[PDB]
Ligand binder design. Structure first.
Ligand SMILES: *[C@@H]1O[C@H](CO)[C@@H](O[C@@H]2O[C@H](CO)[C@@H](O[C@@H]3O[C@H](CO[C@H]4O[C@H](CO[C@H]5O[C@H](CO)[C@@H](O)[C@H](O)[C@@H]5O)[C@@H](O)[C@H](O[C@H]5O[C@H](CO)[C@@H](O)[C@H](O)[C@@H]5O)[C@@H]4O)[C@@H](O)[C@H](O[C@H]4O[C@H](CO)[C@@H](O)[C@H](O)[C@@H]4O[C@H]4O[C@H](CO)[C@@H](O)[C@H](O)[C@@H]4O)[C@@H]3O)[C@H](O)[C@H]2NC(C)=O)[C@H](O)[C@H]1NC(C)=O
Ligand SMILES: CC(C)=CCC/C(C)=C\CC/C(C)=C/CC/C(C)=C\CC/C(C)=C/CC/C(C)=C/CC/C(C)=C\CC/C(C)=C/COP(=O)(O)O
Ligand SMILES: CCCCCCCCCCCCCC(=O)O[C@H](COC(=O)CCCCCCCCCC)COP(=O)(O)OCC[N+](C)(C)C
Ligand SMILES: CCCCCCCCCCCCCC(=O)O[C@H](COC(=O)CCCCCCCCCC)COP(=O)(O)OCC[N+](C)(C)C
Ligand SMILES: CCCCCCCCCCCCCC(=O)O[C@H](COC(=O)CCCCCCCCCC)COP(=O)(O)OCC[N+](C)(C)C
Ligand SMILES: CCCCCCCCCCCCCC(=O)O[C@H](COC(=O)CCCCCCCCCC)COP(=O)(O)OCC[N+](C)(C)C
Ligand SMILES: CCCCCCCCCCCCCC(=O)O[C@H](COC(=O)CCCCCCCCCC)COP(=O)(O)OCC[N+](C)(C)C
Ligand SMILES: C[C@H]1CC[C@]2(OC1)O[C@H]1[C@H](O)[C@@H]3[C@H]4CC[C@@H]5C[C@H](O[C@H]6O[C@@H](CO)[C@H](O)[C@@H](O)[C@@H]6O)[C@@H](O)C[C@@]5(C)[C@@H]4CC[C@@]3(C)[C@@H]1[C@H]2C
Ligand SMILES: C[C@H]1CC[C@]2(OC1)O[C@H]1[C@H](O)[C@@H]3[C@H]4CC[C@@H]5C[C@H](O[C@H]6O[C@@H](CO)[C@H](O)[C@@H](O)[C@@H]6O)[C@@H](O)C[C@@]5(C)[C@@H]4CC[C@@]3(C)[C@@H]1[C@H]2C
Ligand SMILES: C[C@H]1CC[C@]2(OC1)O[C@H]1[C@H](O)[C@@H]3[C@H]4CC[C@@H]5C[C@H](O[C@H]6O[C@@H](CO)[C@H](O)[C@@H](O)[C@@H]6O)[C@@H](O)C[C@@]5(C)[C@@H]4CC[C@@]3(C)[C@@H]1[C@H]2C
Ligand SMILES: C[C@H]1CC[C@]2(OC1)O[C@H]1[C@H](O)[C@@H]3[C@H]4CC[C@@H]5C[C@H](O[C@H]6O[C@@H](CO)[C@H](O)[C@@H](O)[C@@H]6O)[C@@H](O)C[C@@]5(C)[C@@H]4CC[C@@]3(C)[C@@H]1[C@H]2C
Ligand SMILES: C[C@H]1CC[C@]2(OC1)O[C@H]1[C@H](O)[C@@H]3[C@H]4CC[C@@H]5C[C@H](O[C@H]6O[C@@H](CO)[C@H](O)[C@@H](O)[C@@H]6O)[C@@H](O)C[C@@]5(C)[C@@H]4CC[C@@]3(C)[C@@H]1[C@H]2C
Ligand SMILES: C[C@H]1CC[C@]2(OC1)O[C@H]1[C@H](O)[C@@H]3[C@H]4CC[C@@H]5C[C@H](O[C@H]6O[C@@H](CO)[C@H](O)[C@@H](O)[C@@H]6O)[C@@H](O)C[C@@]5(C)[C@@H]4CC[C@@]3(C)[C@@H]1[C@H]2C
Ligand SMILES: *[C@@H]1O[C@H](CO)[C@@H](O[C@@H]2O[C@H](CO)[C@@H](O)[C@H](O)[C@H]2NC(C)=O)[C@H](O)[C@H]1NC(C)=O
Lengths: 112, 103, 96, 7, 37, 160, 33, 626, 97
């Protein structure tokens, strides 16, 4: 069915867009979890980034599945507010760790 | 011979004519390929030009055959047979310009 | 080392043979030119089409690419107008 | 990101 | 070799000459939005 | 560049120091307003400028070519010069939005010195109305750009 | 001549206006199919 | 006042403002410094474009440059892609016929932003084909300011990619439209666009491989219609004969193993369609199984034929530049010039978030939406997304070609939200949250373009403490000396990086250029740059060299000088002459590369060391240091 | 000597009039070739004259055309053009039966 193929493609995209091929060529240490320089990354760091990216993606899809004519209004609204909070929370932690890597980047949404 | 006899009785006249044209194109292409095999390719550019002209006109005529067949009014429904013929002429002109630029 | 000339001439004749077979098969089917009212647009269209193909030959023989592109553009405009006009009249008969 | 040798 | 003191610009005078062309443009625009009828 | 109260003195320092047989090629440009170098009366204009201007102290010039690029409708042209300059025939110059070439005057001279800094004048005549040949082309262009649209929604080109 | 600060302000304001016009287009089209 | 007229006026206005925002965000290198060219590659593009302006077209097609790769000479017309040069020359000719006298360096500088506008328009059309106009306008607003596409497209960077992204997006739009409509006219227009793409960039391999992949997946999904036949067959034939016209491509669409997926899917499609026709005409109960089996056999036979023709040697195998994307460790071992370049190295998540702010997060959501509603074009979109993600994940340089699809997908996702909630408290908060995310995206894009990618490598800028900026202009100083104080036929020797920049700026005959097509010549130059004076002098005598140019960044704090790029010289020279140059010889007995008294005496008498450190042991800065 | 990096052609100059002159053919390799005439003898001075010349490959117009060996292919192409034209006159004005 289409759901399995969609899920597989989505997981492949989320796995590859967090830079897992860098872990294949130059295998980095797991820790000494965040590397200091901009060019180099550890192993756990990209797991963290993959978790946050999947978080934002899940928030988007679940925020759109709550406005489609799903079951009764209770969960239909709980999922919506969950997506609203989920996007902002995971994207703010993502932007905050990115700002933790670039000392000059002056922007922060809900830095926390 | 059921396919042959049935083809004759079932196919309309314009399509049968187009099919004869396809026979001519395919025969010329096969004969050219046979000459190339017998003799080898000294002028390879010319061989590519001629054989790709044969294949190109074959497949443009097959596309006209598909688009003009009344049994395929279901798929297209947006292009008449006359737009199909004009499009055939356009594609053929571009193909022959490239061929004479390449031979 | 190139092949002998007699072989090449024989294959030129053999390449010219399938044309005759097409004509023989078309007179076997019965293809006639009957709907040939002498409209201005039909004659102009077929003349422009033959002109374009003759230009293709002339491009192979002498002209360079910019000249042939210009000449093809003018011929294509003329043939386009004539063909549009002719195709509408042909479609009238089918619909009506 | 250019066509130079990696320094 | 050296030329000398520069010349003051004799072009215009304020409160009349600067806004005169702009006002000519406006005054042409308004009758153009009258040829509707 | 330092702006004095009599001139503008700009010290030029080349890319590399010259040591003998070393050469450089540079371009120095400036545009100045015409209310102090161009005098007009009715239909007759006259431009009074320097033939060669100061480049460095005790300069020596081997070959020189002055070109004056008058505007497009310059009917008559006369040049008054204080010493013998060798002028060549006129050649047209085509610039932004010009239909007919604008007159160029070419004068060559050899072996100038720091004391050939003199003034030449050029008299010419120029109709005032021809100036608004420059704002018209653009207008016409835009009109054509619109006229295309007006001829575009008048075309059917459908077979059925 | 334009400075860097002027052109940066211009780019920011133009991007914001772009996205406002995007959302306005979505509003108009949805409200009046 | 019909809402349709105002709706179309709003669409035209938002496309024009997207054009203007794409043109205005790419001037942060022209407001500062000067309107000149920047990187090593755009100088050759400029030089050949200047030749095309001053000699016409048929002189550029037969142009045999003798002032590059000195003893060998470089056939330029037949070993380059004439898409950027022809476009720049055509715009120059049109613009000078109307008496708008613009120099050709200004056209070469400002060609890229103008084409960025057309790229935005092309994305609008391609996204309108997949989704409603709303996603089209949102995608046209996304790819005009995104930093992943600005990087190698800023005004002054005159390279193959600015035109290439426009041509790629337009070819994909035309193929999607042709498959939807089924007409031969859209296939002919797509073929002409593919011909332009072939002439522009060496990224036509991606287009031609992606189109068979899309057709094959349409076959496996049992979604074969007649329109797919009429699209792909005509496209392949016309595009093949059109692609063979470029001189540098030549006969590679047959001999190479990159253009074999297209012929494979073409043969498989012909067989499939004939068998399906027969099935329709013959009885279904009898001969059905025979038809299924025949399709399978045809596909297997095509695969076997390709394997055999590749193995015997009739079909040449993959190039190394296209094989390092699969082997991923083949570069540093065998052919080190592929691993030497800075572009051919992998990509961390920092670049994925730094080139795309919120798009890289809402992009898989859009992919999910595209999978849920399936159409003939959406399968193509999904394959494009997956392939671009993978290819960009292994090479930094290629990320630009990934940026289009991201935008499209992200646009779709955002449009999806603005469809549902837009038009009480919850819906209003959702709309304001999405709009605020878009604000953050715009501000991030402006910051990244201002601080990161708008920097020339020709003029260096050192900033004073009080905010005053000083410009180190030593490149152009040395090249201008070399231009006006040497003989007209002097030969300079340099590392390959600057080969272009000397022949563009200094106008002198170089020995080794930036474009690498003969690696043993570069091996000779490397051996000359990494031996003592006697062997290097013999090498320099046999090549009739006159001058030697070395960039030394030791007085100021400049990172990439030739000492930092010396080890790659040693490795490249070791690759072709193992008996003369040993890498381990230039290291200390501890095993590290250093310049002190502890360095090896095999390096302290090298020619690069004696050449870039001459009379430097007496140059003491005023600040108290050794 | 006609050298690029190493001599491609070495010939003996022959005296006519008052000059040593030789006529020959340029090899297939393109590039920048130079003539080195170096006369070194025991007692005579050292003569050395080298002039640089560039040998460029053939232009796209100087290729051989209308070769006999390819008279089939030419034919083929033109044949189909003629075919197409005939087909048009028989496809638009065809009379059904
Ligand atoms: C593209 O190309 C163009 C053209 O090449 C480039 O433009 C050029 O850019 C430079 C700067 O980048 C500009 O330079 C400026 O020149 C003025 C003029 O300087 C002269 O006068 C100075 C003052 O002279 C009086 O006072 C002294 C006593 O001190 C007396 O003795 C004199 O007689 C006068 O009465 C004088 O100091 C200068 O001398 C200097 O040079 C000589 C060289 O021989 C030295 O020996 C001297 O020791 C001395 O160093 C000269 O005679 C300068 O005044 C400008 O200085 C400004 O900038 C300095 C930093 O670079 C700063 O330290 C100064 O204080 C001064 O700061 C000014 O600006 C501030 C705002 O930024 C103000 O707040 C401040 O009050 C002050 O006004 C500067 O050196 C060129 O003019 C310019 N060229 C043109 C044609 O315009 C362009 O950059 C290029 N673009 C690119 C590459 O992108
Ligand atoms: C043996 C074989 C491969 C096929 C057998 C044929 C048969 C029977 C069936 C084929 C089945 C199918 C569908 C095959 C297609 C799948 C396939 C081969 C690849 C799928 C993934 C895709 C689309 C790969 C694209 C090809 C590829 C390597 C692209 C990388 C190049 C890219 C993206 C950009 C080029 C940029 C750069 C490298 C160019 C430099 O140019 P310059 O300007 O000169 O520097
Ligand atoms: C619309 C989008 C198209 C984008 C085009 C991008 C630019 C690609 C240009 C690549 C050109 C490769 C070299 C080439 O084309 O060969 C040139 C031909 O010289 C030319 O004139 C090339 C001009 C390009 C014309 C493109 C028209 C396309 C329609 C049919 C191909 C041959 O010139 P000729 O004048 O044909 O020389 C031989 C003439 N004989 C008759 C003797 C044969
Ligand atoms: C190298 C130059 C090549 C020369 C071309 C020679 C053409 C030979 C005869 C062409 C016959 C023209 C047929 C024709 O004009 O019909 C066209 C649709 O027709 C087509 O789709 C084919 C158009 C091909 C011509 C395009 C280039 C012609 C350049 C001169 C303007 C319209 O058909 P319709 O299907 O009615 O489209 C109408 C859709 N609307 C919504 C817009 C109303
Ligand atoms: C809603 C209201 C909208 C109404 C429409 C408004 C449109 C007009 C906006 C144009 C503003 C131009 C910016 C500008 O004027 O700044 C220029 C700097 O000069 C430049 O280099 C910038 C030139 C770029 C401007 C071209 C824009 C034309 C648009 C076509 C795409 C100042 O340069 P200056 O330094 O003043 O030069 C004059 C001094 N001279 C010695 C040279 C004589
Ligand atoms: C609007 C389109 C206008 C058509 C313009 C086509 C001809 C323009 C052209 O010639 O382009 C080339 C330099 O650039 C080129 O080579 C143009 C090649 C691309 C043409 C694409 C064909 C147009 C689409 C086909 C219908 C100009 O160089 P030349 O015309 O060869 O000579 C100019 C140099 N002199 C010093 C000798 C004067
Ligand atoms: C780098 C990326 C490269 C990607 C390459 C992909 C590798 C091939 C993987 C095959 C995918 C398997 C899908 C498949 O099963 O194909 C057939 C349907 O099969 C057909 O209809 C034949 C069409 C294709 C012929 C196969 C030729 C393969 C030759 C290429 C080497 C499915 O038909 P179905 O009958 O629907 O299968 C299940 C349906 N039942 C109800 C019967 C259960
Ligand atoms: C409407 C019809 C008219 C006839 C034709 O088809 C379309 O269009 C003709 C062209 O005008 C060709 C001539 C051009 C001048 C050229 C002069 C040379 O000298 C000579 O060698 C060849 C010649 C005569 C060309 C021969 C082919 C012609 C006649 C072409 C025919 C096929
Ligand atoms: C808005 C449009 C209106 C029409 C036009 O453009 C702008 O405005 C005309 C000018 O009046 C030009 C003439 C001026 C006198 C000049 C005398 C020379 O002596 C002679 O060589 C050229 C000539 C006659 C100019 C020719 C071009 C003209 C007619 C120009 C037209 C193209
Ligand atoms: C809006 C468009 C309208 C058309 C046009 O552009 C602007 O406006 C024309 C001008 O009238 C120009 C002529 C003026 C007289 C001049 C006489 C010289 O003698 C001759 O050398 C040049 C000539 C004939 C100009 C040529 C270009 C023209 C025709 C220009 C056209 C391209
Ligand atoms: C060598 C290859 C050349 C290409 C091709 O195979 C052999 O030769 C085509 C035929 O012309 C077929 C059409 C004929 C009319 C038939 C009418 C039915 O009604 C309809 O169902 C199917 C239809 C249109 C056939 C479809 C498959 C075609 C296009 C076949 C292609 C696969
Ligand atoms: C059915 C068609 C088959 C194709 C063709 O017609 C009949 O048969 C070709 C001939 O071989 C002709 C050439 C002979 C050599 C002659 C050398 C001269 O030198 C040159 O000027 C003209 C040239 C090349 C002839 C031109 C026309 C050709 C190619 C003719 C074709 C149009
Ligand atoms: C629409 C079709 C019209 C027919 C044709 O294709 C396009 O266009 C013809 C040309 O006119 C060719 C002749 C040119 C003059 C040349 C004179 C020599 O003397 C003679 O040897 C060869 C000859 C006659 C060429 C032969 C091939 C022709 C007839 C070509 C056909 C294939
Ligand atoms: C410069 O380096 C070359 C080789 O890079 C040295 O040449 C060799 O020197 C040794 C020393 O005895 C000889 O045995 C070899 O026959 C020489 N040739 C080769 C090909 O190895 C040369 O001696 C060095 N000159 C110095 C260090 O002054």
């Amino acid at each position: 069915n289409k759901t399995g193929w969609a899920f597989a493609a989505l997981c492949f995209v989320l796995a590859m867009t967090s830079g897992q091929m860098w872990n294949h060529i130059r295998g980095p240490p797991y820790a000494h979890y965040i590397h200091g320089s901009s060019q180099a990354q550890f192993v756990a760091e990209t797991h963290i980034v993959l978790l946050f990216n999947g978080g934002v993606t899940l928030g988007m899809v679940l925020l759109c599945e709550a406005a489609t004519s799903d079951m009764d209004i209770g969960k239909r609204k709980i999922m919506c507010v969950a997506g609203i909070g989920l996007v902002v929370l995971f994207f703010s932690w993502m932007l905050s760790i990115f700002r933790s890597k670039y000392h000059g980047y002056p922007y922060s949404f809900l830095m926390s | 011979s059921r396919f042959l006899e049935e083809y004759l009785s079932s196919t309309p006249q314009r399509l049968k004519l187009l099919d004869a044209y396809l026979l001519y194109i395919l025969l010329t292409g096969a004969l050219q390929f046979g000459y190339c095999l017998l003799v080898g390719t000294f002028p390879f550019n010319s061989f590519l030009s001629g054989f790709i002209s044969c294949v190109g006109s074959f497949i443009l005529a097959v596309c006209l055959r598909i688009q003009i067949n009344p049994q395929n009014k279901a798929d297209f429904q947006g292009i008449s047979p006359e737009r199909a013929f004009a499009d055939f002429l356009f594609a053929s002109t571009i193909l022959h310009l490239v061929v004479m630029n390449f031979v | 080392k190139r092949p002998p000339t007699v072989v090449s001439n024989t294959f030129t004749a053999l390449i010219l043979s399938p044309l005759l077979l097409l004509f023989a098969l078309w007179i076997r089917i019965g293809a006639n030119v009957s709907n040939f009212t002498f409209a201005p647009s039909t004659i102009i269209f077929h003349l422009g089409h033959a002109a374009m193909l003759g230009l293709m030959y002339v491009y192979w023989t002498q002209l360079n690419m910019f000249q042939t592109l210009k000449y093809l553009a003018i011929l294509g405009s003329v043939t386009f107008l004539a063909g549009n006009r002719m195709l509408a009249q042909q479609a009238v008969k089918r619909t009506a | 990101a250019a066509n130079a040798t990696a320094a | 070799v050296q030329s000398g003191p520069r010349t003051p610009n004799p072009y215009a005078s304020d409160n009349s000459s600067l806004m005169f062309p702009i006002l000519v443009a406006f005054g042409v625009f308004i009758p153009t939005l009258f040829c509707l009828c | 560049l330092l702006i004095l109260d009599d001139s503008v003195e700009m010290e030029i320092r080349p890319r590399f120091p010259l040591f003998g047989g070393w050469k450089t090629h540079y371009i120095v440009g400036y545009n100045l307003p015409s209310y102090e170098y161009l005098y007009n009366l009715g239909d007759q204009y006259a431009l009074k400028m320097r033939f060669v201007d100061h480049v460095f102290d005790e300069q020596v010039i081997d070959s020189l070519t002055v070109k004056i690029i008058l505007p497009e409708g310059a009917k008559n042209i006369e040049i008054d010069s204080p010493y013998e300059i060798s002028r060549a025939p006129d050649e047209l110059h085509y610039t932004y939005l010009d239909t007919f070439g604008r007159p160029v005057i070419v004068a060559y001279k050899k072996n100038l010195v720091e004391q050939h800094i003199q003034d030449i004048v050029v008299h010419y005549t120029f109709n005032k109305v021809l100036m608004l040949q420059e704002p018209l082309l653009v207008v016409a262009a835009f009109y054509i750009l619109f006229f295309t649209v007006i001829i575009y929604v008048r075309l059917d080109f459908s077979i059925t | 001549m334009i400075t860097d600060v002027q052109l940066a302000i211009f780019a920011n304001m133009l991007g914001v206006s772009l996205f406002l016009l995007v959302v306005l287009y979505h509003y108009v089209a949805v409200n009046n199919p | 006042s019909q809402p349709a007229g105002w709706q179309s006026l709003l669409s035209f206005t938002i496309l024009f403002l997207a054009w203007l925002a794409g043109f205005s965000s790419r001037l942060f290198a022209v407001i500062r410094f000067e309107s000149i060219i920047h990187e090593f590659d755009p100088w050759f593009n400029y030089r050949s474009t200047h030749h095309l302006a001053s000699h016409g077209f048929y002189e550029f097609l037969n142009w045999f440059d003798e002032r590059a790769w000195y003893p060998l000479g470089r056939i330029v017309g037949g070993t380059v892609y004439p898409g950027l040069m022809i476009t720049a020359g055509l715009i120059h000719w049109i613009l000078n016929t109307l008496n708008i006298t613009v120099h050709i360096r200004d056209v070469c500088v400002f060609l890229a932003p103008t084409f960025s506008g057309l790229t935005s328009i092309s994305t609008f059309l391609l996204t309108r084909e997949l989704w409603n106009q709303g996603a089209g306008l949102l995608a046209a607003c996304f790819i005009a300011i995104v930093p992943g596409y600005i990087s190698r497209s800023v005004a002054g960077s005159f390279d193959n990619e600015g035109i290439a992204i426009f041509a790629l997006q337009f070819t994909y739009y035309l193929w999607v439209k042709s498959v939807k409509t089924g007409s031969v006219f859209w296939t002919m227009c797509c073929c002409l666009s593919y011909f332009y793409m072939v002439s522009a960039w060496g990224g036509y391999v991606f287009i031609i491989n992606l189109i068979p992949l899309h057709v094959f997946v349409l076959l496996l999904m049992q979604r074969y219609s007649k329109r797919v036949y009429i699209a792909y067959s005509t496209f392949y034939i016309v595009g093949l004969i059109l692609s063979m016209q470029i001189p540098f491509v030549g006969f590679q669409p047959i001999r190479t193993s990159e253009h074999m997926a297209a012929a494979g899917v073409f043969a498989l499609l012909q067989a499939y369609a004939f068998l399906q026709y027969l099935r329709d005409r013959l009885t279904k109960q009898e001969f059905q199984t025979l038809f299924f089996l025949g399709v399978s056999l045809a596909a297997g036979a095509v695969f076997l034929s390709v394997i055999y023709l590749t193995y015997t040697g009739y079909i040449a195998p993959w190039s190394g530049r296209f094989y390092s994307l699969w082997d991923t460790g083949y570069a540093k071992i065998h052919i080190p010039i592929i691993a030497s370049v800075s572009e051919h190295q992998p990509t961390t998540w920092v670049s994925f978030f730094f080139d795309l702010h919120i798009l890289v997060c809402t992009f898989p959501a859009g992919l999910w939406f595209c999978i849920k509603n399936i159409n003939d074009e959406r399968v193509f979109v999904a394959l494009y997304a997956i392939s671009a993600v993978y290819f960009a994940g292994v090479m930094v340089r290629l990320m630009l070609t990934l940026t289009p699809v991201v935008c499209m997908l992200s646009a779709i996702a955002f449009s999806n939200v603005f469809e549902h909630y837009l038009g009480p408290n919850i819906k209003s908060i959702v709309t304001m949250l999405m709009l605020m995310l878009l604000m953050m995206f715009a501000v991030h894009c402006t910051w990244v373009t201002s601080n990161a990618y708008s920097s020339p490598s020709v003029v260096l800028a050192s900033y004073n403490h009080d905010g005053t900026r000083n410009i180190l202009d030593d490149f152009r100083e040395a090249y201008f000396w070399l231009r006006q104080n040497t003989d007209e036929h002097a030969r300079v020797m340099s590392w390959w990086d600057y080969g272009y920049q000397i022949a563009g700026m200094a106008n002198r005959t170089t020995l080794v250029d930036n474009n690498t097509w003969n690696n043993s010549h570069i091996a000779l130059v490397g051996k000359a740059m990494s031996s003592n004076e006697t062997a290097a002098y013999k090498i320099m005598r046999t090549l009739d060299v006159d001058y030697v140019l070395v960039i030394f960044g030791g007085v100021i704090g400049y990172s990439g000088d030739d000492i930092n790029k010396f080890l790659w010289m040693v490795r490249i020279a070791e690759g072709e002459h193992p008996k003369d140059i040993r890498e381990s010889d230039y290291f200390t007995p501890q095993g590290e590369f250093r310049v002190d008294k502890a360095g090896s005496p095999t390096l302290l008498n090298c020619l690069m060391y004696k050449m870039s450190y001459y009379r430097f042991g007496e140059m003491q800065l005023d600040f108290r240091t050794p | 000597e006609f050298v690029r990096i190493d001599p491609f052609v070495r010939t003996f100059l022959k005296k006519k009039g008052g000059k040593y002159s030789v006529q020959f053919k340029l090899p297939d390799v393109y590039g920048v070739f130079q003539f080195k005439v170096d006369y070194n003898r025991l007692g005579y001075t050292h003569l050395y004259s080298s002039t640089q010349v560039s040998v460029r490959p053939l232009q796209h117009t100087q290729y051989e055309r209308f070769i006999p060996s390819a008279y089939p292919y030419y034919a083929s192409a033109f044949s189909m053009m003629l075919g197409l034209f005939i087909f048009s006159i028989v496809f638009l004005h065809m009379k059904e039966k």
